[PDB]
Amino acid sequence: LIQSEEYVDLTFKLRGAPIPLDNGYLTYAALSRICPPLHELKSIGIHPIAGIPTRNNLLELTAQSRLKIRIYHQQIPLIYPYLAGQAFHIGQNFYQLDIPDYKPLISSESVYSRLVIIKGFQDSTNFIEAVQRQMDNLGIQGKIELLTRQDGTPQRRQLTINKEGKQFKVRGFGVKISELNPEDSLTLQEQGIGGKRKMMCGIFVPATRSKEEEET
């Protein structure tokens, strides 16, 4: 019920050809090529693109599909002229961004992260204690829950970094976090957890997306 200050969500309407469901390095590299200053930013995150799933491991862009960026509201003039109204290419297709809209950061008792990556922690228990430690660093208190598939197993995801000729394997979990209170909820939403924040993973969102991800 508390709208966070100093942090906003820059949302660009996204249109173009269908894209892989694991954009990650693809979208990040495209934006970095379009926006050189995006590489050197620190406290910025790119939202997972919202669109229905299509065949293979691709993702189809709808009219509601939009590129959303979480950024310090004073750092917008560093990337706005490079992104607002410009176009970026994923693979061989051209994608166009229009004038973005600002969305405030709302507090929620239960928050969700579709993907959380911590280096060197692959099992569930070590990952859980690592996220507890990360909460301890930021001084946030809450109960950690892991998103599960239809079989109840904790859900894992993989990030493919196509750096140079070799392709890289970075993997993590998707967690659901509640019992946060609005202040710590906003703190976790801005700060995020884990690494690879610009890599379309590690940021947070309300638990409605948690249930939606649980559905499929």
Partner: protein, 109 residues
């Protein structure tokens, strides 16, 4: 039978529900003893639908219209196929279906 018309019909129904939600929102917008127009709302909707010039126009328009329609139950049970019908088919055909839905909307209220 020949489920294309089934998709056409529940598209009409979801359009009618979304427009009803929008008329309710307009009812919320107005205040004091001025009579909230009803026919003028339909005229305004028709004029805005005719304002578009293909593809991006009327597609983001009608998507926004459905979104502002509010809690649409049949839309909830018919998210995916309605979205697929929106993405496919010529936009002028979608406009024709929307206009027919407007012309057949009233007996709800």
């Amino acid at each position: 039978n020949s489920e294309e018309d089934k998709q056409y019909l529940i598209f009409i129904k979801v359009f009618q529900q979304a427009m009803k939600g929008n008329f309710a929102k307009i009812y919320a917008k107005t205040e004091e003893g001025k009579d909230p127009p009803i026919k003028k709302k339909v005229e305004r909707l028709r004029a805005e639908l005719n304002y578009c010039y293909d593809e991006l126009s009327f597609k983001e328009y009608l998507s926004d219209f459905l979104v502002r329609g509010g809690l649409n139950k049949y839309f909830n049970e018919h998210q995916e196929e309605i979205a697929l019908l929106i993405k496919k088919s010529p936009w002028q055909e979608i406009r024709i279906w929307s206009l027919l839905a407007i012309a057949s909307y009233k007996p709800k209220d």
